[PDB]
Amino acid sequence: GKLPPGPSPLPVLGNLLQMDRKGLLRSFLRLREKYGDVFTVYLGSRPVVVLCGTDAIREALVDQAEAFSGRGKIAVVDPIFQGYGVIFANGERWRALRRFSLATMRDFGMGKRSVEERIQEEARCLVEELRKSKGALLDNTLLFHSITSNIICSIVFGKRFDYKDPVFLRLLDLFFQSFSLISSFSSQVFELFSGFLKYFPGTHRQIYRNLQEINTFIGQSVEKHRATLDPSNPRDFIDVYLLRMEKDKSDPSSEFHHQNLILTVLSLFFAGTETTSTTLRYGFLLMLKYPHVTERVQKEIEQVIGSHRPPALDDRAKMPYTDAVIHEIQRLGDLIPFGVPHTVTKDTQFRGYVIPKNTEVFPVLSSALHDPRYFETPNTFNPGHFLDANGALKRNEGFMPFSLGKRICLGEGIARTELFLFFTTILQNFSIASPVPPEDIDLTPRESGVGNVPPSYQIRFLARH
Ligand code: HEM
Numbered sequence: 456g457k458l459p460p461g462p463s464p465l466p467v468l469g470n471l472l473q474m475d476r477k478g479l480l481r482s483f484l485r486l487r488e489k490y491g492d493v494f495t496v497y498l499g500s501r502p503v504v505v506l507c508g509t510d511a512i513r514e515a516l517v518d519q520a521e522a523f524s525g526r527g528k529i530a531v532v533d534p535i536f537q538g539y540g541v542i543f544a545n546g547e548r549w550r551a552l553r554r555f556s557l558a559t560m561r562d563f564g565m566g567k568r569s570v571e572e573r574i575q576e577e578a579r580c581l582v583e584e585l586r587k588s589k590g591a592l593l594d595n596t597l598l599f600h601s602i603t604s605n606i607i608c609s610i611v612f613g614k615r616f617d618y619k620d621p622v623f624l625r626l627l628d629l630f631f632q633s634f635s636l637i638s639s640f641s642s643q644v645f646e647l648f649s650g651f652l653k654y655f656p657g658t659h660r661q662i663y664r665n666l667q668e669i670n671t672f673i674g675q676s677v678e679k680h681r682a683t684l685d686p687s688n689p690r691d692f693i694d695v696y697l698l699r700m701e702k703d704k705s706d707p708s709s710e711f712h713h714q715n716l717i718l719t720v721l722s723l724f725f726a727g728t729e730t731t732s733t734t735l736r737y738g739f740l741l742m743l744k745y746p747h748v749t750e751r752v753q754k755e756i757e758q759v760i761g762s763h764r765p766p767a768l769d770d771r772a773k774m775p776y777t778d779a780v781i782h783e784i785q786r787l788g789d790l791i792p793f794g795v796p797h798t799v800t801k802d803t804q805f806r807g808y809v810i811p812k813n814t815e816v817f818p819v820l821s822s823a824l825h826d827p828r829y830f831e832t833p834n835t836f837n838p839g840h841f842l843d844a845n846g847a848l849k850r851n852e853g854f855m856p857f858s859l860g861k862r863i864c865l866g867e868g869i870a871r872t873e874l875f876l877f878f879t880t881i882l883q884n885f886s887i888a889s890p891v892p893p894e895d896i897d898l899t900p901r902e903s904g905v906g907n908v909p910p911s912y913q914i915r916f917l918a919r920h
């Protein structure tokens with residue numbers, strides 16, 4: 456059988472000359488033009504099948520679910536994970552860690568409170584914090600990280616850190632600093648000639664160093680956990696894992712050991728922080744470009760929720776407008792423009808092609824979220840893409856900002872609760888304003904890579920009465 460169509464590789468250099476100085480995403484989309492929806496390109500000596508549009512991705516990730524369930528690797532961070540922890544595990548280790556990982560976020564945690572209740576509490580702390588700024592213009596970057604972290608922290612490390620605590624301000628810097636270097640221009644060069652480049656200095660050193668410094672903190676918290684553990688009454692994620700360590704003393708094939716634990720907390724502690732939060736950032740940037748929409752969300756909050764009780768997650772179903780606005784921030788925000796890389800698990804017959812076992816597959820989620828076949832005028836913000844005549848919420852197949860399939864975002868339910876409660880709680884209590892007029896807000900990312908990062912912007916949060 457055949458590999459999909461695509462340009463001709465100079466070996467060692469692969470397809471360097473058919474790429475584009477813009478980035479990995481521009482490059483793939485510029486080839487989509489020539490070779491179709493499924494196609495093959497050469498990053499270094501490595502072949503990758505590339506998937507485009509709703510229909511291609513869905514065929515692969517959902518119709519050949521298991522076939523496409525394997526994970527690839529981000530060269531810039533594989534020094535750190537090396538096939539360990541939940542994001543980057545594969546086969547049995549992955550199955551095991553995902554399974555445990557779903558179960559554990561749903562139930563055991565700080566104050567034995569529900570994830571909702573916890574996100575509620577964080578939101579309550581964001582409000583009090585924001586009030587303190589008295590409407591002065593800030594940059595919302597830092598607070599937006601603080602609040603997403605503290606959720607993940609409260610789950611994994613069983614506690615939340617105070618916004619000014621310098622132990623914690625330093626984890627946030629590392630995390631933000633890395634996630635931006637991760638998706639800088641250099642780290643994409645690196646995605647191509649990792650083999651050659653991993654010798655000379657560069658941006659991957661910095662990322663490695665930064666990540667190792669988080670592992671240190673993760674490490675020294677596992678230890679406190681283990682010391683002061685209690686079998687009767689597991690505090691949180693780490694505590695539960697340790698008890699599963701004990702349950703598994705006599706299983707030689709148990710995957711619950713110190714590497715996976717450390718690197719699972721790193722994955723969670725990463726994703727938990729750096730996406731749910733840049734989404735919020737982008738979301739508020741859009742609200743500054745579209746005060747009309749913000750007034751409608753704010754009226755909808757006034758009707759369904761009112762101005763005294765805090766927002767609750769069951770309100771979402773009663774608030775389709777807001778729910779559309781959030782959908783539409785995820786779609787246009789589009790913070791993972793070409794998925795996290797997959798690999799096929801067996802030899803696979805795809806659109807009458809053979810994709811050999813272990814060949815890397817890039818589901819380009821951004822070309823689904825901007826897919827003209829499913830969204831009109833797909834580069835413009837419109838909450839209407841998710842509403843019908845009657846103002847009811849309206850599902851759309853092109854909408855997969857969390858990927859699809861067997862590898863679908865595990866955090867999805869937390870992400871969605873954080874989005875809904877954080878935007879409705881801020882918007883219930885504050886009115887927003889920037890110096891920049893709506894007509895000159897630019898939505899062009901400060902970095903477009905393996906993830907998208909919105910530009911910095913000023914914003915002010917005015918207490919409503
Ligand atoms: C709105 C914010 C988020 C977005 C847009 C998002 C999106 C994604 C995407 C696109 C993937 C790749 C799925 C794939 O290619 O198979 C993924 C994987 C993953 N995400 Fe999320 N995510 C978000 C929030 C979170 C949160 C809050 C957590 C923390 C619990 C999280 C944890 C994970 C994990 C553990 C994986 C790996 C799943 C696996 O490999 O089995 N994500 N996410």
Ligand SMILES: COC(=O)[C@H](c1ccccc1Cl)N1CCc2sccc2C1
Pocket residue numbers: 532542634637721722725726727729730790791795905906
């Ligand atoms: C690839 O761009 C990201 O936004 C990711 C991401 C977010 C959510 C789910 C999975 C992923 Cl990989 N992060 C956050 C977690 C980690 S671990 C090493 C690097 C990154 C960058």
